[PDB]
Design a protein around this ligand. Structure first.
Ligand SMILES: Nc1ncnc2c1ncn2[C@@H]1O[C@H](CSCC[C@H](N)C(=O)O)[C@@H](O)[C@H]1O
Ligand SMILES: Nc1ncnc2c1ncn2[C@@H]1O[C@H](CSCC[C@H](N)C(=O)O)[C@@H](O)[C@H]1O
Ligand SMILES: [Mg+2]
Ligand SMILES: [Mg+2]
Ligand SMILES: [Mg+2]
Ligand SMILES: [Mg+2]
Lengths: 212, 217
């Protein structure tokens, strides 16, 4: 069983991934994804989740008192707290494999300039906390990051959801003047494997030379 | 104004585009996002979009005929065709800046093992095509990649408008016995700027040493 709790000021963002889960997996208790509106834990009539940054400058920072109450309710000692942030450690396939055997993931979705750092610092004194970036670009909020993380993790949980892969082909064998490489139709499966290995080598050199 | 068309066999998964700033920039009329069900271009009653690979291997490959018909209708020679794929060139902030000036993005979302390579090759004879990865992990489909790309681009379009950022803080100045760093309360702009620059470079060497030219863990 895995439980994923997502905390966000835009709970509707996560609803399609929630409905995408197969009923058989939910019934078997293999997975449970719950989404929580952060404003449940606000203190004031205006339901304030952000405030001006200390030290000045642009933007707003999400309030520690709101997030602290939210995580106090949702997390336990067993929780892995995931904090999406462009300033995080890289989220990779290795991370996804590690997290796919966790019992309880809580994803704290930030907005504006992010969450007051004391929230993560305090949480880290009683649970495991992981600040992660999903790539070398800037999003407006953590919800899209949460969707990526949930998909990448849950497709590694059975029954729920370095060279580059080369091109793939299906019917018809000729289409708009372009033929499927004839080796693929040859029935020489050792040669096909060598051909695919060379295609992967060339693609990796062209697109991802960092992978060598 | 920018037009973004997203083509997918799961158009409901794109409903989050209507949320937050993508939703607002849509509402503000700076960008129009249209989502298309790929199965509209099928002709059989089983509405088949996939078929087994040539040369063997597990899984299914998305058929070129259906994609070619869809892109024929949606794309023009001015279109920038975006094809999410874990085997793509990296999508980065620089890419987002470049695409923020485009008139027309079309995002072809794959499923199964991906789209027959000839779809991108054929499209590239008429238009610019970019196969891109959003990161070093594997998704089940291109729809989440589409949402990431749209978000990153739309916050840069004119009309809405290196190193890791260090920590941020807001009120109260002491919380659960944890204090905001006193320099941030001090009003000394030069000392605050110097502390923030130091925190940024310190976080970068710890979390992303590659950005400063050092070996990765
Ligand atoms: N590349 C990325 N990976 C993961 N989350 C990201 C992200 N880019 C933006 N976000 C999310 O969007 C929110 C707003 S970005 C705010 C943080 C600030 N821009 C910084 O540089 O640290 C973040 O708190 C995070 O939740
Ligand atoms: N890192 C990534 N970046 C962009 N798109 C991705 C992606 N990972 C998966 N996808 C999308 O998800 C689809 C299916 S993943 C393609 C099969 C893959 N070789 C595998 O290991 O199973 C892709 O066609 C692409 O649209
Ligand atoms: Mg942040
Ligand atoms: Mg995965
Ligand atoms: Mg790649
Ligand atoms: Mg694709």
């Amino acid at each position: 069983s895995m439980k994923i709790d997502v905390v966000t000021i835009f709970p509707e963002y996560l609803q399609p991934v929630r409905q995408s889960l197969p009923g058989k997996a939910i019934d078997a208790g293999l997975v449970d994804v719950a989404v929580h509106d952060l404003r449940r834990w606000t203190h004031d009539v205006h339901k304030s989740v952000d405030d001006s940054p200390y030290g000045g400058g642009p933007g707003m920072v999400m309030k520690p008192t709101v997030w602290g109450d939210a995580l106090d309710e949702i997390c336990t000692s067993e929780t892995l707290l995931v904090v999406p942030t462009p300033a995080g450690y890289p989220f990779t396939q290795e991370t996804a494999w590690q997290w796919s055997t966790e019992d309880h993931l809580v994803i704290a979705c930030g907005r504006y300039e992010g969450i007051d750092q004391r929230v993560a610092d305090d949480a880290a004194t009683r649970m495991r906390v992981r600040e992660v970036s999903i790539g070398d670009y800037v999003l407006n909020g953590g919800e899209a990051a949460a969707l990526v993380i949930i998909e990448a993790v849950l497709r590694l949980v059975p029954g729920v959801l370095s060279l580059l892969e080369g091109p793939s082909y299906t019917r018809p064998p000729s289409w708009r003047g372009m033929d499927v490489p004839p080796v693929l139709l040859s029935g020489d499966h050792a040669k096909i494997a060598a051909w695919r290995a060379e295609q992967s080598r060339q693609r990796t050199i062209e697109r991802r030379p960092d992978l060598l």
